[PDB]
């Protein structure tokens, strides 16, 4: 099947070079175009510019002087750099393709897209801490806990419950900012706890730390 | 550029009913406006293009009319996984132009949150701060809100929440607030409460517990 995929950085400083990479298979650069979209927060789509069958370029004329667009054919990746980002923005970026023939078809296929963070913080570990009832508070045949992440930097996280077993009313919820850093809870119930054993995994990527945490009392 | 303007923003139906959604572009661009898919997990997918014709492996309940400026998505007899957003392309130049998209929310019988309320844990405490937390799992509709109350008197300063999308299963909500406050704060006051008004009840849902019981 006809894939794409984008690849780069999660985190980036102002001012540092944004390198994108646009992985293909299953057709040749050399038939299709490729095109850059983005989606800036809170908002829609936004062309960036092509990377052509034969080997041109073109971009969005207000974005042209600071994008470069360009390819290896031999890997079957295409490449945006781009360079002034906006501190604190949070955009995603996306490749998607098209081609011209009898006439131009929309694009047929995307990729998924990836989301890059702006910002001159450091990369900050999260803190997980147990959601557990108590202070007088009777504890019903099913029971709600949870894994409270806290005070991280840059998204994102990943939860799952021992390791994957249980996946009973799991919610994950959005991430939440406030003095630059995340912090998310995420819930399972239980009709067996405590005597059965709760236990959060919690991951973050960007610091390569990955804690459980047991939920209890 | 050719201005694509969609309409509405949002819509909300059951599954086997019908809805339909708009795409205006700025001049006349014959038959060629595309529709598309967007669901969490998935790439942006192709529905129809050249106004009516659909791709490949569409279901006969998706439909697009018209040629012109004016253009129209139907999609009838909904299956739940057809809620999600959908955003029309024009085809006809570069550079390629866009709808803003329709978020379409699947309609489902009322269902009263399950609130929870989660006192800080020793190993938070441990390190100065204190975290309250409040869970309202598995709702419709969306509307809620929530209050925190100290010692009867609601703060609102330390309160952050978020609500999570419509669950793939049962299609409901949930939202977590947390209450941060320091731990002499946190031991400063007794009462913790949170409070919580959905349609789904004539009065307020409320649990609370005493710090002096922890
Ligand atoms: C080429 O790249 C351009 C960026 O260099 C893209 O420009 C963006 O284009 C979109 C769509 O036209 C703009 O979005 C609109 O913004 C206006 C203005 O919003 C602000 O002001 C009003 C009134 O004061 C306020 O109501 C808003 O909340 C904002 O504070 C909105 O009225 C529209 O609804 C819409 O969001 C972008 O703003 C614009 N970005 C910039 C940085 O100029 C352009 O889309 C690209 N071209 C192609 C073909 O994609
Ligand atoms: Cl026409």
């Known amino acids: 099947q006809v894939q794409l995929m984008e690849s780069g950085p999660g985190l980036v400083q102002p001012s540092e070079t944004l390198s994108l990479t646009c992985t293909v298979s299953?057709?040749?650069?050399?038939?299709?175009?490729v095109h850059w979209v983005r989606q800036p927060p809170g908002k829609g789509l936004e062309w960036m510019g092509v990377?052509?069958?034969?080997?041109?370029?073109d971009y969005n004329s207000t974005l042209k002087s600071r994008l470069s667009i360009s390819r290896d054919t031999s890997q079957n990746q295409v490449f945006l750099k781009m360079n002034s980002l906006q501190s604190e923005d949070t955009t995603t970026y996306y490749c998607?393709?098209?081609?011209?023939?009898?006439?131009?078809?929309?694009?047929?296929?995307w990729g998924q897209g990836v989301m890059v963070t702006v910002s001159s913080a450091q990369t900050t570990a999260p803190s997980v801490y147990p959601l557990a009832p108590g202070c007088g508070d009777t504890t019903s045949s099913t029971v709600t806990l949870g894994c409270l992440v806290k005070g991280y930097f840059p998204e994102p996280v990943t939860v799952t419950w021992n390791s994957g077993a249980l996946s009973s009313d799991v919610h994950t919820f959005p991430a939440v900012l406030q003095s630059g850093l995340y912090t998310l809870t995420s819930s399972v119930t239980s009709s067996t706890w405590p005597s059965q054993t709760v236990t959060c995994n919690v991951a973050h990527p960007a610091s390569s730390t990955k804690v459980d945490k047991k939920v209890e009392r | 550029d050719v201005q694509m303007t969609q309409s509405p923003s949002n819509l909300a139906a059951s599954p086997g009913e019908s809805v339909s959604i708009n795409c205006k572009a700025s001049?006349?661009?014959?038959?060629?406006l595309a529709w598309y898919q967007q669901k969490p997990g998935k790439a942006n997918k192709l529905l129809i293009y050249?106004?009516?014709t659909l791709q490949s492996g569409t279901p006969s309940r998706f439909s697009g009319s018209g040629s012109g400026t004016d253009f129209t998505l139907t999609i009838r007899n909904l299956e739940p996984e057809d809620f999600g957003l959908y955003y029309c392309?024009?085809?006809?130049?570069?550079?390629?132009?866009f709808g803003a998209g329709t978020k379409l929310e699947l309609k489902r019988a009322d269902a009263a949150p399950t609130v929870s309320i989660f006192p800080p844990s020793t190993e938070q405490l441990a390190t100065g701060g204190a975290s309250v937390v409040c869970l309202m799992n598995n709702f419709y509709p969306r509307d809620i809100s929530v209050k925190w109350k100290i010692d009867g008197t609601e703060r609102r300063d330390g309160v952050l929440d978020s609500v999570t999308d419509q669950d793939s299963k049962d299609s409901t909500y949930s939202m977590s607030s947390t209450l941060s406050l320091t731990k002499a704060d946190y031991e400063s006051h007794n009462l913790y409460t949170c409070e919580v008004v959905h349609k789904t009840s004539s009065s307020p849902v409320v649990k609370s517990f005493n710090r002096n019981e922890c």
């Open positions: 998607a393709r098209d081609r011209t023939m009898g006439m131009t078809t929309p694009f047929d296929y």
């Open positions: 990377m052509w069958s034969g080997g041109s370029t």
């Open positions: 392309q024009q085809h006809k130049e570069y550079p390629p132009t």
């Open positions: 001049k006349r661009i014959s038959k060629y």
């Open positions: 050249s106004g009516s």
């Open positions: 299953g057709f040749s650069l050399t038939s299709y175009n």
